[PDB]
Amino acid sequence: ALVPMVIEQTSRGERSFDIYSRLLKERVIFLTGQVEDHMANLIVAQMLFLEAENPEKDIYLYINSPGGVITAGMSIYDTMQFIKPDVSTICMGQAASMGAFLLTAGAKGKRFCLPNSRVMIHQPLGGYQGQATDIEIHAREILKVKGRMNELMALHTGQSLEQIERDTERDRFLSAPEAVEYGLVDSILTHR
Amino acid sequence: ALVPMVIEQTSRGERSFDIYSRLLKERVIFLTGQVEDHMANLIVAQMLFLEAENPEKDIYLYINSPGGVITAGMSIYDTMQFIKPDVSTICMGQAASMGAFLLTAGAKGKRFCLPNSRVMIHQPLGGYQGQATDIEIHAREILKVKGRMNELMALHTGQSLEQIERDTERDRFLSAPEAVEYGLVDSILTHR
Amino acid sequence: ALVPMVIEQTSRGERSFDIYSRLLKERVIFLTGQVEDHMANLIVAQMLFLEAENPEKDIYLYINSPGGVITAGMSIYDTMQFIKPDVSTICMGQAASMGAFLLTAGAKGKRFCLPNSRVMIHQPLGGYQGQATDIEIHAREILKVKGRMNELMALHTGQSLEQIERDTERDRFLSAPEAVEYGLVDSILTHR
Amino acid sequence: ALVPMVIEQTSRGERSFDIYSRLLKERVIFLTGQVEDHMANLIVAQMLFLEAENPEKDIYLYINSPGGVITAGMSIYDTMQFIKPDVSTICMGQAASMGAFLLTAGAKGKRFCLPNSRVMIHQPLGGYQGQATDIEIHAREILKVKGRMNELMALHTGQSLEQIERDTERDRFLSAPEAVEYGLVDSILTHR
Amino acid sequence: ALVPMVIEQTSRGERSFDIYSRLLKERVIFLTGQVEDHMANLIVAQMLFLEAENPEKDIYLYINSPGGVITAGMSIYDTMQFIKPDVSTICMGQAASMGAFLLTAGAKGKRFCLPNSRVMIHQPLGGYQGQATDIEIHAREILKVKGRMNELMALHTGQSLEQIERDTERDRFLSAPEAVEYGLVDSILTHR
Amino acid sequence: ALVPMVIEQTSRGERSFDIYSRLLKERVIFLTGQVEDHMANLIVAQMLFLEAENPEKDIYLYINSPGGVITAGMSIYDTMQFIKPDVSTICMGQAASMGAFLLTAGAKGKRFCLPNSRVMIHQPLGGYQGQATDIEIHAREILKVKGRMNELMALHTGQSLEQIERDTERDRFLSAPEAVEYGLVDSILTHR
Amino acid sequence: ALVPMVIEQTSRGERSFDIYSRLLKERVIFLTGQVEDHMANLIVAQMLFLEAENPEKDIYLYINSPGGVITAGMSIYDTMQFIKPDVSTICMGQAASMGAFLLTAGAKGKRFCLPNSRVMIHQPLGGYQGQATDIEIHAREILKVKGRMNELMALHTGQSLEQIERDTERDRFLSAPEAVEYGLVDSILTHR
Amino acid sequence: LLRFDMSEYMERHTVSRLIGAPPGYVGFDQGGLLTDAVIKHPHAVLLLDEIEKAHPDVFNILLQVMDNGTLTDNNGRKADFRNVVLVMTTNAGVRETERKSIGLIHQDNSTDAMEE
Amino acid sequence: LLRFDMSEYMERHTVSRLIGAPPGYVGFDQGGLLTDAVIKHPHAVLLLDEIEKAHPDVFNILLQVMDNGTLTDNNGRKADFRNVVLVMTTNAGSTDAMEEIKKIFTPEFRNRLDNIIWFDHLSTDVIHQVVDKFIVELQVQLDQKGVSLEVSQEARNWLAEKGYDRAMGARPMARVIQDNLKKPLANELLFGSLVDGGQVTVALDKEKNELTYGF
């Protein structure tokens, strides 16, 4: 019983799903844990599935994650931007690193966050071992990524690019009210 | 058969389910083991589900746990405060550290613990490795969390803030009658 | 078939359940292995279920275990006292340490044990590492627990508290006839 | 297909059964592999379930296993003694140590073994580490167990007690014809 | 899809089967991998089932295995001799060690093999650590087993006992035509 | 519930399918993780299955992978070229190494990648240990593969062969706009 | 869905199948990964099942494998030759070592291979530790196997025996067009 | 207008209602609704509502009235449909045009312009 | 008024029970239950209880009736519903009430309803009014038998509080009034301690809450 079952009444009186398929039906997707490749692949499939069911309605994405792989996380980012309905992102627990990046990528005006949550941002990490010639190739690529990530942060948050660059030099922690003032989220949820 | 099946009759019958799904149906949620992200996420999915099923009825949360990750635990805390129905928390076995924190977060007047249980509280733990500059950043963040956790304890228990600070410097153990007097719980359940 | 299936005729008939679900339906619960936190939690879920199925009928608990975590064991103990119907405990194989404790907690007059079984009692174990200040904090808590366990033994067995105090100094082994004489069980089952 | 499926005609089926459930329905229980604590409870559950359907019908317990925990297959002994039917214990492969202990415990006149089987009997094993005081306590308990197991062998085999003590000091192996002469079994099956 | 499904039609039709159960229905049993204790136990159950479905028809046993435990292999042997219908053993791939002794144990005249198969026979292995007294006891038992296996080989193959003992001193490999000449099998299957 | 279930409505409806089978029905196949042997084998089975369902409709392959084994990847490649309907490949996340070769092999005019994706290409890797004679044989074979892979890149992209060889000496990273200019993809998808 | 589900259309309806059972029905068997006993045991079961279904129709075997155990591979070989319908083998990805051996064993005129595949052939490997006497016995057996495998290669390919013996001394790699000239396959598939 | 509602024939048991029970069966001497209606009113419009709800084997009766013009009752008398206009109605192919494909690139999904 | 309990039509074979079996099938000559009733009483009120439990096939029977006013009997006769009114009751509840009935009453069905009438929970004033009605009916019977009965206010409050259940509404009231008031009185009247010309006033005993009276 790692995942409980729930029963609902439908046209024939009964359907029996788990504790997650039942919520997908209510257009809720959860993103938790490390942003890897298999997990990201599943989230994209779920978002495409919901768009087709009803292109006019919002999709709710709950975020609680420590970070992850950028490449994996750029899928999802591009899907959220490609598909038609708004994706509203809600931060609970934490949104760190790549998690914070996806949090701000939600539809404008719909970037919420619970009151005791934390958001943390920083420049990307990486590394390489090899010949001096190969080291240069790999060093250049990580720097281009750093630059691209900074532009997207500035675009979504409204901060100037230079301000974004200064703020990601070292781990920056923001409390929920600070995320609102900074521009990572639009508001704090209080009570239903 | 790690988890047994149970049978119930309604209209036409059948519809057999597991021992935990059967209790979720009775708006009962259990929280055991360490508090971490994958588990905390499930506790939240269950609470969102039950709210949707019936916004006016109480949700019962059983708490038996040694502690855990604060971030994961805070996502549980905020959901409990956000949703509409009251959450009544019941302590059996132990509620230590983060477990104790969530226990006192239940609806006022509805925080109950069994007579041979134990509650233990303490200041948060953490750590870090890095440059002196990074050490400063991370040390500041843990101290801010300590401060916030103490404010919430004072709010929920009725103790002054200074009294809460003194009491969490070293592990503090409370017996069920002590938890009632201190203000962590409202009462001790005895017999049905 | 790690666990075999059984078939039972009722009304419609057929209805094939598990070898353990068939017994849960017969208000039979088995307790085995070490007493921990994940397993003890299931024992409690089963007792609450049976209590809600029919508050007027007994629950039979079959005990065969070497010991366990005191905290996990206490959540079982308190449920067994809270719920309305009597729990009749039966000792087969062995009941040692915490297992012995739960055995004597059954309803008075309904504590049985098979003739070649063994029961063993001893003092509570524990430990700690840290500053001299923390060592004194943890040492006092284990001693309080020891005192509480002795009082419950005296309550359930009829022995004076001092007699219990002496008999728990070192491991003490009792044969089924000694369990009856001592007061841990009321009787020995023999033949159908 | 670790375990194959079988079909049989009853009333309005069909109805498939596990390669092992199909045989439980034929009042045949297999005891194979080393006697543990989890496997022993499953054997006990099957015997009670077989004593609930029809108490006036023999239960066959095929036994092929090299021994195990004494105090956990000394709870499959007490369930056989106690139930209403007769448990006729056939032999195959090997019955060693505790396995050879349960084989002789079957209904008198119904203990059978196949011709190329082997039965081996011996003195019980154990051990301990600790203070000289604790060593004494544990040594006494194992000796008490040894004495009790010898009494039961003498009872079930017809040998004098002294003969049983001499014969178990060191491992003794018996061929199927010797098991018959010694009295561990009543007869040898050959061909249908 | 480690194991594929197949379907068949009879009366109502459907009958969706795991491919191995589909063949059990055709009185075909496979023996592969090491001859252990759990696997042998399952083969015996299958043979008893087939002998109870139709006592007058042959049961084919397909053998492809490197060897295994003698004790487990012997329960398979005794069951084949006990049950009424002939058991025809076919061997494709290899039949080595215990896998070759059971290959010759099939019904006389029905011991066909493969054209590119290999059969290997050898003296049994074992070992022991302990006091000189215990070593003697165990040495005697393995020698008794060796003697018994030689008798059965001579019985089933038609070779004299002395010839069997000489030929098992060291591993002996036989090609399919040699197995036929030696008397391990009756014939070689070629093309349908 | 690692993978959610969805409900589809049609002539009869009530068709409960996994989040991945539901998409296979939409002629959508995903390629993620390393290009191994078992995974490639499964993709081929799906493409052959779709070709038979409707030879006149396109198949969409979603690519997000770091690379893998060339041999396994070539079986996917050859199938794509053999079957009748066009295969349209979409790159997201990353298409590196063999993933990049699998991307450009799609139908001309239908190779598309999302704007924040990355494509990386490089010469084959390999190795060997053995006698100087064996080393030569193995070295020659890897060089033949390098030559063949370069011919296919030139064929599908329009670059001259000499240009392809120079560009695959060391890891080369291309952003989505460069992949388009270079000729690995035909276009960039942006917003629906 | 590690393995996806598909739906077909027969006289009744539904009929849901795995991404592999559906193809078994079309008389398609896949051989992938390393050859060993359990996998080699399942393929034989499938080929026998298909012959019975319809003795007058071809069976298609898709091969993609690095090699494996000869014994296991030979039971597949013999079944292919024994059964009545032609078995047509198709090489995709690679066919090395034992894989190549089985590839050429298909029905004459029906041995195909995809354009970018690779076939590799070599003399058998093995080894032994023990007394000089045992070493001799095992060395002789491996040499007999080498001789037999060479005869079968010459038989199926049309090459003289001397030519096969020279060619397999060191790993020999062949491209799809060379496999055709050599005679391992009859032709290359290109486009439908 | 002769009108029949196919939702009343959802089980392989409502066919005798249309043509009559066999000789020796409790309902034998009643006749049969479809053949009696057609015999009495040879020039008519025959409507079968929601013909996607009849048990599928009921179609096998129509498959004998559409080709040859006749249906035989349980007395061997024949209904003659040559002057009857037959109309069947259904919404069977509808729920196949109300959806979009799932993916980044759209298809057509109109050929199943309900051949399904 | 014609009444049917739809909980008796939960199983598939019961659908023909309402209309009548096809000819040649057991029981066809017994007729149906619904179609004969509407032939015999064409102007009646038709009430279907708990229509949120019937087997889905009966809904096709209902859709046909609501759509055109008629059903055909297994003897070929027409059941003409043009003069009857159809009332169906449900515990389905508006969106949820809708989904629970809608599940079978899909839009294709709901569009055939003329209305939905909603029935409210009882207030405390109503449960007192309901008790007054029950008491009055007893008072009338007693006057006919020559006995005057008056129930005190503390007696009325208790009965209203006791015979009302939020989960059963006013249904339990029938037994609460009968068992506490009618029964004890019936015993005395028949025995003859209380006779024509008698009077009883019913008060509560504060420590028992029994209805106590005599003459």
Task: Please tell me the distance from the alpha carbon of residue H105 to that of residue B77, in angstroms, as a whole number.
Answer: 42
Q: Which two tokens stand for residue I118?
A: 């909603």
Whether C41 sits inside 8 A of B32 (CB atoms) is yes
Among D4, D175, D116, A86, smallest CA distance to E140 is for: D175
Contacts of G4 by beta carbon, 8 Å cutoff, 6+ apart: F18, F20, F21, F24, F46, G18, G19
- How large is the angle between the packed helices E70-82 and E38-53, nearest 10 degrees? 10
Among A84, A81, A75, smallest CA distance to A36 is for: A75
What's the gap between Cα F150 and its chain centre?
16
Residues of I in contact with A25 (CB under 8 A): none
Task: Please tell me the distance from the alpha carbon of residue D145 to that of residue C118, in angstroms, as a whole number.
Answer: 10
**CATH code assigned at E150:** 3.90.226.10
DSSP string, A156-172: HH---HHHHHHHTSS-E
DSSP string, C116-161: T-EEEE-PPP----S-HHHHHHHHHHHHHHHHHHHHHHHHHH---H
SS3 call for A129 = coil
DSSP string, chain I: -EEEEGGGG-STTHHHHHH-PPTTSTTGGG--SHHHHHHH-TT-EEEEETTTSS-TTHHHHHHHHHHHSEEE-TTS-EEE-TT-EEEE------HHHHHHHHTTS-HHHHTT-S-----PPPPHHHHHHHHHHHHHHHHHHHHHTT-EEEE-HHHHHHHHHHS-BTTTBTTTHHHHHIIIIIHHHHHHHHHTSS-TT-EEEEEE-TTT--EE---
CB I108 within 8 A of CB I60: no
Task: Please tell me the distance from the alpha carbon of residue B98 to that of residue B72, in angstroms, as a whole number.
Answer: 10
Task: Please tell me the distance from the alpha carbon of residue B102 to that of residue B156, in angstroms, as a whole number.
Answer: 10
How many angstroms separate the CA of residue I105 from the nearest CA in chain A?
9
CB D79 within 8 A of CB D44: yes
The shortest CB-CB distance from I24 to any of H7, H27, H36 is to: H27
Query: What are the backbone dihedrals phi and psi of residue E36, each rounded to the nearest 5 degrees, phi first?
Result: -90, -140
No. of helices (H) and no. of strands (E), chain F: 7, 9
Task: Please tell me the distance from the alpha carbon of residue C24 to that of residue I209, in angstroms, as a whole number.
Answer: 43
Among G101, G79, G98, G74, smallest CA distance to G29 is for: G79
Q: Is F157 exposed, middle or buried, given 0-12, 13-18 or 19+ CB atoms closer than 10 A?
A: middle
Whether H13 sits inside 8 A of I25 (CB atoms) is yes
- Longest CA–CA span in chain A (Å) reads 68
The tally of CA atoms less than 13 A away on the side-chain side of residue G46 is 26
Query: What are the backbone dihedrals phi and psi of residue B188, each rounded to the nearest 5 degrees, phi first?
Result: -105, 130
Residues of D in contact with C177 (CB under 8 A): none
Strands D16-18 and D5-7: antiparallel
| Distances, alpha carbon F177 to alpha carbons A75, F118, F180, I118, in Å | 17, 10, 5, 63
Task: Please tell me the distance from the alpha carbon of residue F178 to that of residue E3, in angstroms, as a whole number.
Answer: 46
SS3 call for G45 = helix
Amino acid identity of residue A75, one-letter, is S
How many angstroms separate the CA of residue B144 from the nearest CA in chain C?
24
Strands H78-80 and H70-72: antiparallel
Q: Which two tokens stand for residue B80?
A: 């409990």
Contacts of E133 by beta carbon, 8 Å cutoff, 6+ apart: D170
Among A171, A174, A45, smallest CA distance to A104 is for: A174
How many angstroms separate the CA of residue F113 from the nearest CA in chain G?
25
Q: Which two tokens stand for residue G21?
A: 């059972």
Task: Please tell me the distance from the alpha carbon of residue D80 to that of residue D39, in angstroms, as a whole number.
Answer: 16
What total number of domains does chain E contain?
Answer: 1
Among B26, B190, B4, B182, smallest CA distance to B103 is for: B182
User: CA of A12: which chain I residue's CA is closest?
Assistant: I103
Contacts of A152 by beta carbon, 8 Å cutoff, 6+ apart: A101, A105
SS3 call for H33 = helix
CB F90 within 8 A of CB H104: yes
Question: Does residue B38 sit at the I interface (CB-CB below 8 Å)?
Answer: no
Residues of D in contact with E74 (CB under 8 A): 92-93, 116-117
Residues of I in contact with B13 (CB under 8 A): none
Angle at G128 between CA G123 and CA G130, to 5 degrees: 155
Query: What are the backbone dihedrals phi and psi of residue I82, each rounded to the nearest 5 degrees, phi first?
Result: -70, -15
Gyration radius of chain E's alpha carbons:
19
CA dihedral E183, E185, E190, E191 (to 10 degrees): 140
Q: Which two tokens stand for residue I152?
A: 């005190």
Specified resolution (Å): 3.0
Among F48, F53, F156, smallest CA distance to F105 is for: F156
CB F103 within 8 A of CB F62: no
User: Which of the residues F122, F138, F156, F175 is marked catalytic?
Assistant: F122
Q: Is the dihedral of CA D67, D69, D70, D73 positive or negative?
A: negative
Q: How many CB atoms lie within 10 A of CB I197?
A: 9
Gyration radius of chain I's alpha carbons:
24
What are G118's strand-pairing partners? G94, G175
Contacts of I132 by beta carbon, 8 Å cutoff, 6+ apart: I156
Amino acid identity of residue F80, one-letter, is M
The shortest CB-CB distance from A71 to any of F2, F94, F191 is to: F94
Strands C59-65 and C28-32: parallel
Q: Which two tokens stand for residue B141?
A: 């963040």
CB H48 within 8 A of CB H14: no
Kind and range of the H or E element at G29?
strand G28-32
| Residues after which chain C has a gap (C–N > 2.5 Å) | none
Inter-chain contacts counted by CB atoms under 8 A, chains A and H: 11
Whether A49 sits inside 8 A of H101 (CB atoms) is no
Contacts of C70 by beta carbon, 8 Å cutoff, 6+ apart: C98, C124, C145, C149
Among F148, F134, E173, E118, smallest CA distance to G122 is for: F134
Task: Please tell me the distance from the alpha carbon of residue B95 to that of residue B106, in angstroms, as a whole number.
Answer: 13
Q: Scan residues 77-106 of H and list those with Cβ closer than 8 Å to A.
A: 99-104
Q: How many CB atoms lie within 10 A of CB C125?
A: 9
CB I48 within 8 A of CB I87: yes
Q: How many CB atoms lie within 10 A of CB H85?
A: 11
CB I60 within 8 A of CB I98: no
Name the DSSP class of H7.
G
Whether E171 sits inside 8 A of G38 (CB atoms) is no
User: Which of the residues E122, E138, E156, E175 is marked catalytic?
Assistant: E122
Task: Please tell me the distance from the alpha carbon of residue I50 to that of residue I35, in angstroms, as a whole number.
Answer: 20
Task: Please tell me the distance from the alpha carbon of residue G98 to that of residue G94, in angstroms, as a whole number.
Answer: 11
Whether C134 sits inside 8 A of B19 (CB atoms) is no
- Longest CA–CA span in chain F (Å) reads 68
Experimental method: cryo-EM
Gyration radius of chain H's alpha carbons:
19
Q: F touches G (3+ CB pairs < 8 Å)?
A: yes
Residues of I in contact with H33 (CB under 8 A): 72, 76
Q: Is B183 exposed, middle or buried, given 0-12, 13-18 or 19+ CB atoms closer than 10 A?
A: middle
Task: Please tell me the distance from the alpha carbon of residue G51 to that of residue G60, in angstroms, as a whole number.
Answer: 12
User: CA of D92: which chain E residue's CA is closest?
Assistant: E75
Query: What are the backbone dihedrals phi and psi of residue C172, each rounded to the nearest 5 degrees, phi first?
Result: -125, 125
Instruction: Give catalytic residue positions of D.
Output: 97, 122
DSSP string, G176-187: HHHHHHHTS-SE
- Subunits touching H (CB < 8 Å, at least 3 pairs)? A, F, I
Amino acid identity of residue D115, one-letter, is P
SS3 call for A142 = helix
**CATH code assigned at I135:** 1.10.8.60
Residues of A in contact with B75 (CB under 8 A): 64, 92-93, 114, 117
Contacts of G115 by beta carbon, 8 Å cutoff, 6+ apart: F78, G176, G188, G189, G190
Kind and range of the H or E element at H49?
strand H44-49
Domain span including residue F155: 1-192
- Subunits touching I (CB < 8 Å, at least 3 pairs)? A, B, H
Strands E112-113 and F87-96: unpaired
Collect all residues from C whose CB is shorter than 8 A from any CB in D. Answer: 1, 3-7, 14, 19-20, 22-23, 26, 30, 32-33, 62, 64-65, 92-94, 114-118, 170-173, 175, 189-192
Among H94, F12, I108, I49, smallest CA distance to A12 is for: F12
Residues of A in contact with I103 (CB under 8 A): 9-13
| Distances, alpha carbon H27 to alpha carbons E6, G101, H75, H77, in Å | 45, 72, 13, 17
Task: Please tell me the distance from the alpha carbon of residue C5 to that of residue C17, in angstroms, as a whole number.
Answer: 6
Residues of E in contact with D33 (CB under 8 A): 37-38
How many angstroms separate the CA of residue D92 from the nearest CA in chain E?
5
The shortest CB-CB distance from H105 to any of F11, F57, F60 is to: F60
Question: Does residue B12 sit at the I interface (CB-CB below 8 Å)?
Answer: yes
No. of helices (H) and no. of strands (E), chain B: 7, 9
User: CA of F111: which chain H residue's CA is closest?
Assistant: H105
DSSP string, B148-162: HHHHHHHHHH---HH
Strands A59-65 and A87-96: parallel
How many angstroms separate the CA of residue E65 from the nearest CA in chain G?
8
| Distances, alpha carbon E48 to alpha carbons C145, D26, E27, E74, in Å | 57, 11, 11, 15
Task: Please tell me the distance from the alpha carbon of residue I12 to that of residue A173, in angstroms, as a whole number.
Answer: 64
Query: What are the backbone dihedrals phi and psi of residue D130, each rounded to the nearest 5 degrees, phi first?
Result: 160, -155
How many angstroms separate the CA of residue E12 from the nearest CA in chain G?
11
Among F19, B27, F21, B26, smallest CA distance to A21 is for: F19
Contacts of C73 by beta carbon, 8 Å cutoff, 6+ apart: C35, C40, C98, C101, C102
* Long-range pairs of I113-122 with CB within 8 A, sequence gap ≥ 24: I113/I66, I118/I93, I121/I166, I121/I169, I122/I164, I122/I169, I122/I170
Name the DSSP class of H28.
G
Q: Which two tokens stand for residue C147?
A: 């005192």
Q: Which two tokens stand for residue I38?
A: 């509407």
The tally of CA atoms less than 13 A away on the side-chain side of residue G82 is 19
Q: Which two tokens stand for residue I92?
A: 């389905």
Task: Please tell me the distance from the alpha carbon of residue D147 to that of residue D165, in angstroms, as a whole number.
Answer: 9
Ramachandran assignment for G158, one of left (phi > 0), alpha (psi -120 to 50 degrees), beta (any other)? left
SS3 track for chain D: CCCCEEECCCCCCCCEEECCHHHHCCCEEEEECCECCHHHHHHHHHHHHHHHHCCCCCEEEEEEECCECHHHCCCCHHHHHHCCCCEECEEEEEEECHHHHHHCCCCCCCCEECCCCEEEECCCCCCCCCCHHHHHHHHHHHHHHHHHHHHHHHHHHCCCHHHHHHHCCCCEEEEHHHHHHHCCCCEECCCC
Inter-chain contacts counted by CB atoms under 8 A, chains D and E: 84
Strands F5-8 and F15-18: antiparallel
| Residues after which chain B has a gap (C–N > 2.5 Å) | none
Q: How many CB atoms lie within 10 A of CB E2?
A: 11
The shortest CB-CB distance from I106 to any of A9, A11, A13 is to: A11
CB I2 within 8 A of CB I45: yes
What's the gap between Cα G179 and its chain centre?
15
Whether G19 sits inside 8 A of F133 (CB atoms) is no
What are H70's strand-pairing partners? H80
Task: Please tell me the distance from the alpha carbon of residue E5 to that of residue E17, in angstroms, as a whole number.
Answer: 5
SS3 call for B32 = strand
Distance spanning both ends of chain H, measured CA to CA: 30
Gyration radius of chain G's alpha carbons:
19
Interface probe, candidates B32, B34, B60, chain C, greatest C C-beta count within 10 A: B32
| Distances, alpha carbon G165 to alpha carbons C172, E116, H81, I98, in Å | 77, 20, 82, 81
Task: Please tell me the distance from the alpha carbon of residue E107 to that of residue E99, in angstroms, as a whole number.
Answer: 16
Contacts of E100 by beta carbon, 8 Å cutoff, 6+ apart: E119, E120, E121, E184
